[model samples]
Target chain A: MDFSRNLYDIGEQLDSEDLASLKFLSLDYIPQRKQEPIKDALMLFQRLQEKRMLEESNLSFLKELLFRINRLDLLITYLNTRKEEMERELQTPGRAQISAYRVMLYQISEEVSRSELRSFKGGLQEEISKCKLDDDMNLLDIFIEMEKRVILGEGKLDILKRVCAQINKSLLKIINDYEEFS
Target chain B: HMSAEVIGQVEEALDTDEKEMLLFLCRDVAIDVVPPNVRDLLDILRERGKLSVGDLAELLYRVRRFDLLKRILKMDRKAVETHLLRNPHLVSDYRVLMAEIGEDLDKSDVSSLIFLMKDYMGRGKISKEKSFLDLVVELEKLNLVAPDQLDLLEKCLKNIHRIDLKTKIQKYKQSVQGA
Candidate 1:
């Protein structure tokens, strides 16, 4: 089944805790808005309708967020304003509730991320490559390795060392990136 | 010890420097050890014509880092010497690895790279710009990166180096020159 259709179907059986978990996870998604000219309101409307498929899951707010909005900039600006409310909703969590929500959140996040990124298609090669803990033959890891390599390969090694300095901030952001069970 | 006909053909083609090199190669190497596929490739080159990368790919059914070097050996005595560094002896094994990897990556990914490489040499429509970000922008217009395909983009960008690209082109150049 299509991801949205399946998520829509699952919305029927969700308990109150599940509802809270879903709501919190949906809220945590990063809305990356970049500026570009030439707006397509019709395309935006279609995306909103697709988002509305999960409206019964009590994540209707996000569906509304996807539509009835002129620009991604405005949408994220509104979201930033509502951050405190979203934070409050994400604060408290029971252990199992948190675990369940996290797994579902990552799964759906991967789904959405895969939709946005063409290279995430899974197969034996992907499985084997990710399975490797080493650098060789891991094409995905190799790409990551090469991104760093190019800078050094071109003799701009200093930028990479600076990137490590920011690792602490990156880790902290990741820790708080997602919502906990509400 | 050798057939007169074969020795005459060898002598007719060799200059003094080449004669010395050919004698050394013959004394050290058993030409019979060469595999059927390699022989077949050379035979095609001798009879029909030279093969470009696209043409050789059809015959080999796979590309490798060393196939180009191996093909070059058929053309002239010095061809292999120039490409010796790039030629590894483990091509059959590498071809096995290539097959496995091919099953993982789709044809479109291959086509994308093929175009990128071809563009570098002035054959393909797409070009590999000097700026990585610029290339990304161009690739985006091809709808190569849809909104849903961002993870894949990150995967490609983060892991693979363009060296993998340079290797393929070098291989192509050697074989086409041999052809």
Candidate 2:
């Protein structure tokens, strides 16, 4: 019952973009190590259920994610949530399942360029293991690396803020924006 | 702890400009602050039982009114900054972004922004009399603009010769993507 046929059926409908959006929303919920390899929506759902974050008794997280990704059709087809119905429901505070902090990190990862990444790598000269970081690592992977080193985590973005200050003002301001709410 | 003499003294310290900015900053902490003038805004918010020294200190700090912070509230600038971090600012980050955008724009820039958005103004959600922030709020309601979905906004800012604001939009789109 964990991986229902409905799960596979819904996975069949999700395209690459939808899957990426879903994965990004689940960044806080999923393990950093398990995230990069996910290419199937069904697999993502299974992981969610594995964490006990998704279940028949409570599908708010799934519904909220789908709503955020603007995939109301999937909500209707699979979750029985109508668009207008969800609109009113989502208006209530503290209803969203995704963490605002994780959303901030995902946004930074998306915006971080190779130039900044190189600088970020250089900035962390002592922390990251030499030859451990692959050339293919994106900013999100670098964040995971920082997490592994105990350098970065929730409310611990000073290093990231420092790097961004040197390389990009907008990036620094983004952290500043979230700090107001932290 | 606020009294009439204290209120008058504090109110006296604020000029017309400080008053408006204070109201704008308090837009989140205090609801239904329609009056633009400080005196009326203060009275209404106080009546609503939402006014507090903490709220005043936070808004004052944001508008960079450090003089009042020290003179009236005895709050040190550095200490308030630290406190701001330990607590949420109550103002939405998106609203802050919009406010910054409006600040960087002149009357002409706002007019140009309005003219550029003619096609998206169906149901008159945005139009002739709105400020840049007003347009953004309406656009947000229609789901045309959002924390992550700011492509149209970035596009418009570039058209207005404010690539800086455009870049700001990009950073925020990815930046608040977490918050």
Candidate 3:
């Protein structure tokens, strides 16, 4: 056994069942990173060794650690092999999209003063139905649609301001996700 | 004096540590000794019975106790949801939440780097007579440039740009990234 092999290699050695045996790592577990990122990556691997699951964002974090450690050689190898699968997974409707959409819908629902756009429940459902039909439907599309509805509703400017701000925040979230994706 | 029921509700709502802290604040407190914001929160808790989480969140926001407000919202998510029905913006302000967390982290880094920068500036190492990049190289040699501290340095440089320091920082970033 080549004990000198890195944690990434060990991580690869673990099968699906072994992955399921890994525990979840909380955000605060590795509070600071004093050494090279490999130490932090090892801690992350240990933390996620049992009950195997990592959020997409957390997975990106691990990849970042790997990139910093010059283990991007293996990272590129891993991604190259699973490139198609990764693309497919990203294409699928996911939490990132849903959450961004949900924030807008929630804000729109609270919108009063203008009865015209105060109730977005029906529009939300309609949009969801459309999303179900069209695989091309994305979070940004849904968000823009919702924004249009709210703008047309002519709600109070204060309420409109909050909604716009939330949308802007969601947009920033998407931009960060894309940065990670790249 | 808060009613026993209200006090009991708060006591029950908070965990043991929180309860103890609240009790500590409840006892004859000095406004001078206590943080003004903490005193305000305590006073409001004592004076107001059955204050909804939204109202509490608003109070916390007014006092600029964003970290406390974030914790309270997390602990009483249902309360926040219930309150959100009436007041939408209380929780809808994601930028505010993110800014508080980001600013706290960035502020610490900014302060540390500025302290270091000031020292270097005073040493005449950051003047036109000497290159800013050379000062950075010197700082790095001294190990004052901790990992992840480069970003804050670049930010500082960008903010105080004099004669292409920003461009120099960009070059430094590229070299570091390349390595």
Candidate 4:
């Protein structure tokens, strides 16, 4: 009997939003070789396996990904793991599979206000060619585009810090606090 | 029998109308978590991996459609309740009562209530696309109606002239208040 089917079971339960955050978090770990986005969580998990980021013995990456997306329920249900377990694991030095920059982007992007999205849409027009100020493109998409352009990375959140300064000051605190640790 | 035979039998026998009540009554169950079409729920129940005949039987009894439970699952109310003692009340008793109230409502009765919903919540909130069961779910979401907070529902029922349902609500209210 295959135990890997457990990941497949959890994959079916996640929605489009879940997949979006998951793919974004995997940016540092998995190389994006394809034009189209990862179709589903199962595919993403497969890619992670290819990179040796996720394995039967080593599931810290998967656990951290689910925890980053605020899906502690999934971690508990599928993995027989819990919130505190992942927290303790991530706190161990050099144990986190996700980069701190990736975590910071995700955390702040969640609170990006609707009006701020519009403001950033205008602010990013010159910086990001794809922003298009499009209504369908959310704040998270914009941050992904930032990473895609290499404008935001391990030591580069200055563009984001400035963007937050204009429309959303609270987000600056997330980046600010992130800067302190890094 | 397996969940396959049980799911197949229920899917075959249950019509669109009855299916709506089944979903309404299954508010807090696993099948109700993400929300899917009624047929999706059939597959969802099967996908449980540890699918129990009792799970489907309990949902049927909660929906108040006992014919399937008896005919297919060979379960009576006591049998359903006994399985539920191990798995306590998959569907809330209060949700079952609300669904039963929707059951007694006729086509026009539900239609009239939909029109009146605009008054309690704003006209913008009312959507004719919603079914009677859907509206009740929305009312619960807005905290405008509950097992105990049936004032808005009672007033709306009073206007709609469904005195039988009004009496049912009053009975539930008195019972709830007395307890």
Best by TM-score: 4
Q: How accurate is candidate 4 locally (lDDT)?
A: 0.76
Worst 10 residues of 2 chain B by lDDT: B123-132
Query: What is candidate 1's lDDT per residue for A110-151, written digit by digit as tens?
Result: 223332223322322243332222312222233233343363
DockQ of each: 0.03, 0.01, 0.02, 0.01
**The 10-residue segment with the lowest total lDDT in model 1 chain B:** B20-29
Pairwise DockQ winner, candidates 1 and 2: 1
Clashes of each: 18, 8, 5, 0
In CAPRI terms, model 4 is classed as incorrect
* DockQ of predicted model 3: 0.02
Ranking by TM-score: 4, 2, 3, 1
List CA RMSD, all candidates.
Answer: 21.1, 25.0, 21.0, 20.5
How well does candidate 3 match the true structure in TM-score terms? 0.22
Clashes of 4: 0
Name the runs in model 3 displaced over 4 angstroms.
Answer: A1-5, A8-41, A54-74, A77-82, A89-162, A165-182, B3-179
lDDT of 1 at B149: 40
Tens digits of lDDT, candidate 4, A47-69: 88887878888887888889999
Using all chains and alpha carbons, the TM-scores for the candidates as numbered come to: 0.22, 0.42, 0.22, 0.48
When sorted by lDDT, best at the front, the candidate numbers are 4, 2, 3, 1
* Docking quality (DockQ) of candidate 2: 0.01
- Higher-DockQ candidate of 1 and 4: 1
